[PDB]
Design an enzyme around this catalytic site. Sequence first.
Site, PDB file in Angstrom:
ATOM      1  N   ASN A   1      25.740 -59.724  76.264  1.00 65.87           N
ATOM      2  CA  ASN A   1      27.867 -58.956  75.665  1.00 65.87           C
ATOM      3  C   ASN A   1      28.691 -59.576  74.625  1.00 65.87           C
ATOM      4  O   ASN A   1      27.882 -60.114  74.266  1.00 65.87           O
ATOM      5  CB  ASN A   1      28.599 -58.447  77.137  1.00 65.87           C
ATOM      6  CG  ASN A   1      27.695 -58.626  78.219  1.00 65.87           C
ATOM      7  OD1 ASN A   1      27.864 -57.340  78.555  1.00 65.87           O
ATOM      8  ND2 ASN A   1      27.473 -59.271  79.465  1.00 65.87           N
TER       9      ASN A   1
ATOM     10  N   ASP B   1      31.046 -60.801  74.115  1.00 60.94           N
ATOM     11  CA  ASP B   1      31.637 -61.889  74.261  1.00 60.94           C
ATOM     12  C   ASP B   1      30.129 -63.859  74.383  1.00 60.94           C
ATOM     13  O   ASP B   1      31.062 -64.600  75.047  1.00 60.94           O
ATOM     14  CB  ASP B   1      32.296 -62.519  75.230  1.00 60.94           C
ATOM     15  CG  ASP B   1      31.529 -62.557  77.010  1.00 60.94           C
ATOM     16  OD1 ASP B   1      30.596 -61.437  76.208  1.00 60.94           O
ATOM     17  OD2 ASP B   1      32.142 -62.571  78.616  1.00 60.94           O
TER      18      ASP B   1
ATOM     19  N   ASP C   1      24.406 -60.491  81.284  1.00 58.76           N
ATOM     20  CA  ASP C   1      24.077 -59.666  82.715  1.00 58.76           C
ATOM     21  C   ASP C   1      22.530 -59.801  83.270  1.00 58.76           C
ATOM     22  O   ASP C   1      21.905 -59.523  82.200  1.00 58.76           O
ATOM     23  CB  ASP C   1      24.785 -58.550  82.558  1.00 58.76           C
ATOM     24  CG  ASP C   1      26.479 -58.541  81.795  1.00 58.76           C
ATOM     25  OD1 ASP C   1      26.816 -59.777  82.289  1.00 58.76           O
ATOM     26  OD2 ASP C   1      26.320 -57.050  81.459  1.00 58.76           O
TER      27      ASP C   1
ATOM     28  N   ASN D   1      27.067 -61.018  85.609  1.00 58.92           N
ATOM     29  CA  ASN D   1      27.763 -62.122  84.628  1.00 58.92           C
ATOM     30  C   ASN D   1      27.118 -63.377  84.258  1.00 58.92           C
ATOM     31  O   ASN D   1      28.168 -64.397  85.208  1.00 58.92           O
ATOM     32  CB  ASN D   1      28.961 -61.311  83.643  1.00 58.92           C
ATOM     33  CG  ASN D   1      29.127 -62.070  82.614  1.00 58.92           C
ATOM     34  OD1 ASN D   1      29.808 -63.121  82.466  1.00 58.92           O
ATOM     35  ND2 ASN D   1      28.312 -61.357  81.480  1.00 58.92           N
TER      36      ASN D   1
ATOM     37  N   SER E   1      28.396 -63.477  76.806  1.00 51.07           N
ATOM     38  CA  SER E   1      27.592 -63.974  77.618  1.00 51.07           C
ATOM     39  C   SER E   1      26.362 -62.917  77.980  1.00 51.07           C
ATOM     40  O   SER E   1      26.338 -62.211  77.465  1.00 51.07           O
ATOM     41  CB  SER E   1      28.794 -63.618  79.100  1.00 51.07           C
ATOM     42  OG  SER E   1      28.840 -62.642  79.665  1.00 51.07           O
TER      43      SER E   1
ATOM     44  N   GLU F   1      23.249 -50.309  87.212  1.00 49.44           N
ATOM     45  CA  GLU F   1      23.921 -51.109  86.330  1.00 49.44           C
ATOM     46  C   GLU F   1      22.336 -51.583  85.446  1.00 49.44           C
ATOM     47  O   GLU F   1      22.391 -52.638  84.691  1.00 49.44           O
ATOM     48  CB  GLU F   1      23.839 -52.368  87.206  1.00 49.44           C
ATOM     49  CG  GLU F   1      25.875 -52.602  87.844  1.00 49.44           C
ATOM     50  CD  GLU F   1      26.455 -52.577  86.126  1.00 49.44           C
ATOM     51  OE1 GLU F   1      25.346 -53.035  85.266  1.00 49.44           O
ATOM     52  OE2 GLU F   1      27.991 -52.462  86.699  1.00 49.44           O
TER      53      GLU F   1
END
EC number: 3.2.1.17
Length: 129
Positions: free
Chosen positions: A46, A48, A52, A59, A50, A35
């Site tokens: 991301n 959208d 991480d 998120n 958002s 990750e």
Amino acid sequence: KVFGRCELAAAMKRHGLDNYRGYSLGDWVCAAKFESNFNTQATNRNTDGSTDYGILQINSRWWCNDGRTPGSRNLCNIPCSALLSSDITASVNCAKKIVSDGNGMNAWVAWRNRCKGTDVQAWIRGCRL
């Protein structure tokens, strides 16, 4: 902070992640590797909108507040910046809520795609735990 494989395993174990909800320490270490590459400061935006954050790439749309994600639920009740700290406590406490969310570790796409069904024990091999 960039964790070493065994140092992270020990810190996660100390924080009660080893076998939390049935997931081995190897699953968690494998998830952090893929990750964020063991880097607490990792962030990834991301499509959208958002973002991480941290070693476990939590998120902003659901778990933490970064002030720039409309419709954020902030279920872990923490600013996303708290997730990038050298001390993993906040990331661990939030991950426990996520993993208990009904879909287990499948919530982490790197775990599902790169750890799930593999010899995850290899990730803690050689460590003094």
